[PDB]
């Protein structure tokens, strides 16, 4: 009624400010730069240790160790350089949907349909890997978890709310109820002061770890968001959606700077990532292969087709040396 | 160079053998997906015989290791996590036969759920098992409440002999394909061993179909 | 009144087409199974069958050069030894692998519990070694005595001498007849009584269980089994019966006459060799997934 | 009505945010890329001498 009308008036007011702030297309500014994104990317390494579909993966700070989780029930930490399996952590629940790797490498997270963020410690006196803490406080399935420090973790579940957890404490010290749909992605800023989350309501909302507040909301999509990563600088981020279009938003302009759409693709976008410099964008699609888009010219730079199934999660190493990409074929491939 | 690398390679090979052994054990187990609008009905099936996210129920029947998943405890968007169960052997659908007059329309909600999962791209070749719950109460309830309360096009005598068949026929006609998926409808009984016997017989048929496709004789 | 020339032309054409299509199909199957597809029980069984048939097809030109030269063998004694043992190993392995695949299908259809519980990759690898060891043990007499004896006319032929030392031509003939007849009986038994009957029983049980339980929604499961059984029978049964007939009259055969029996043996051998090349066309290429993966890889 | 009231308060509270020019934001975004273009293994093909992957 009156309250709904006031919300509609506020919605009309905020969009007018964004339109007034906008003066020209962002791609038009970068139309005069030489496009050097045309590269040839091959299969440098192939990893085959999973007996089931891989749903998530994460890179390490040293860019030598990567984690991968599958539906078999095994969490494997791979040595990227030597291909050897450093660790193979069994999982109580085989139905997993996300996994995270600590910046210091001391901890590894795992979440799934059993809505428990089981965190395992890698550096332990015993040879075997034991469970450190089981964060069982969520209602829906965990969809994305990310490590800020060795003591705090942010996990996004399917119950429309995100939560900040502490391994030492074991309880949610911060809860984000601003979303309306099921949150399906997470991405931390380089300084870890703020993060954004993509939900099933086709909107991505910015959050603050220290405050717990929702600074701003982006609603530039008509389909549910499946992945998100911040720009290397941290002033921008890109969200991938099932409508085969992934868009890049800015923390200041707050609208669609670039739009990566092609008429020959209709498959839902599953993974989105940025390189070290952020000039080229790594995007994973549901057409059994991923693609590379120029983050400044909004054109597809190269085609990366080496997987026998759809991509689930792909990540770029911290140093930007090589990008690794998993898939449902139980094969993880590191490409440079 | 070859000193620490050999230890890492040996460690990788040693755990890989364990993964293969664990992978064989995982493939040995047969998986059964469960869901349905009848959240009360599924509890009776699980508790009929001896053996938080989702609940995994593991038991063995006639030298076959069954694995039973309780998904009705999950309340979220189905398409965002239903692809995880793409490799299940056979889905078990539990629906209450007496939910036709509940408002919550309850039977219509289950009908939509049944149609929504039969048309899923992840269950193209996954045959689903059907269980009709509260059969004993259903025959008593139809005497006082006609079955045509929620069915706009029902024309027949209100007796359990043909009313149950009509419900089974209606459910079996919700499939867009009738060759890859075979629905095994059963009438739940008070006997504990008879409830699980149908599951073993149904799973045996599904295993035969998977073996035939794997061997190429399909 | 003599159709020997037309029969020889037919045999040459059959050998050539067998070689080319078997080599091509077996190479494609080996590549797809080893690299494009993951290893499963049926996948590794088909890979083993493809290896066994591909080695035989690769060695087939060494029979082509012998047939073109007739009795004369223009290659070395060690090469003849290697060829005549590898071909026997390939044929025995192919027959035993067909029998093993039939038994595997029978145990998968009749006992789903057993194939769900115990039938895995490791058990498949363990059971695969069986047929190969059995073939090696049965062929051991071929390795022992297949020395390429020369001829008085000038043509040197690869044949079982059966005697390293020739005490007397009559004694050598008698020993050769005895060894040939016992080897023929053993070959006929172990290659037709066990394998063919096991295959027939397995496919009959599969057909009966798929008919008495209504597990077939189409004629394809029955048609494929009938086609493969008929192909195996038509390829091997005439060869086995002709070999048995030759074994019965081996004493008269070794004297020099009965050239008609020899040409019948040759044509039945060609027909049996045709199986080693038509095996991938039915056991592998018939599968929809196999064809789709082969198309995608190419 | 509590959820609706919170949404209305949230929308009005986030209005006071410092906007920046889109062209300036676009120039800032590309400024980082060109500054880090030299140290970009994905953009410039790194030689195999120092490439950890070969």
Residue numbers in the entry:
A (entry chain B): 5 to 340
B (entry chain A): 5 to 55, 182 to 234, 241 to 354
C (entry chain R): 19 to 316
D (entry chain C): 9 to 62
Give the article text.
In response to the N-formyl peptides from microbes and mitochondria, FPRs play crucial roles in host defense and inflammation. Although FPR1 and FPR2 share 69% sequence identity, these two receptors display distinct ligand-binding preferences. In contrast, FPR2 is promiscuous in ligand binding with recognition to a vast array of ligands with diverse sizes, structures and functions, ranging from small molecules and lipids to peptides and proteins, which enable its involvement in chronic inflammatory diseases such as AD, systemic amyloidosis, and atherosclerosis. In this work, we determined the cryo-electron microscopy (cryo-EM) structures of FPR2 bound to Gi and four peptide agonists with diverse sequences and lengths, including Aβ42, fHN, and two formyl peptides, N-formyl–MLFII (fM5, derivative of bacteria-derived formyl peptide) and N-formyl–MYFINILTL (fM9, mitochondria-derived formyl peptide).
FPR1 preferentially recognizes short N-formyl peptides such as the E. coli-derived peptide N-formyl–Met–Leu–Phe (fMLF), and is associated with antibacterial inflammation and metastasis of malignant glioma cells. Furthermore, we also solved the structure of FPR1 in complex with fMLF and Gi to better elucidate the ligand-recognition modes of the FPR family. For FPR1, the flexible C terminus of the receptor (R322–K350) was truncated to improve protein yield and homogeneity. The binding pattern of the fMLF residues L2 and F3 at FPR1 aligns well with that of the residues at positions 2 and 3 in the formyl peptides at FPR2. Owing to a spatial hindrance caused by the larger side chains of residues F812.60 and Y2576.51 in FPR1 (L812.60 and F2576.51 in FPR2) and a different orientation of Y2576.51, fMLF moves toward helices IV and V, excluding its contact with helix VII. The FPR1 residues involved in fMLF binding are highly conserved in FPR2, except for F812.60, F1023.29, and Y2576.51 (L812.60, H1023.29, and F2576.51 in FPR2). However, the single FPR1-to-FPR2 swap mutations, F812.60L, F1023.29H, and Y2576.51F, and their combination showed little effect on the binding affinity of fMLF to FPR1. The narrow entrance to the ligand-binding pocket in FPR1, which is adjacent to the C terminus of fMLF, is positively charged due to residues R842.63 and K852.64 at the extracellular tip of helix II. Although these basic residues do not form any direct contact with the tripeptide, they may provide an anchor for the C-terminal negatively charged carboxyl group of the peptide during initial receptor–peptide recognition to facilitate the entry of the peptide into the deep ligand-binding cavity. The extracellular tip of helix V and ECL3 in FPR1 move inward by 4 Å (measured at Cα of P187) and 6 Å (measured at Cα of G/Y274), respectively, resulting in a less-open ligand-binding pocket in FPR1.
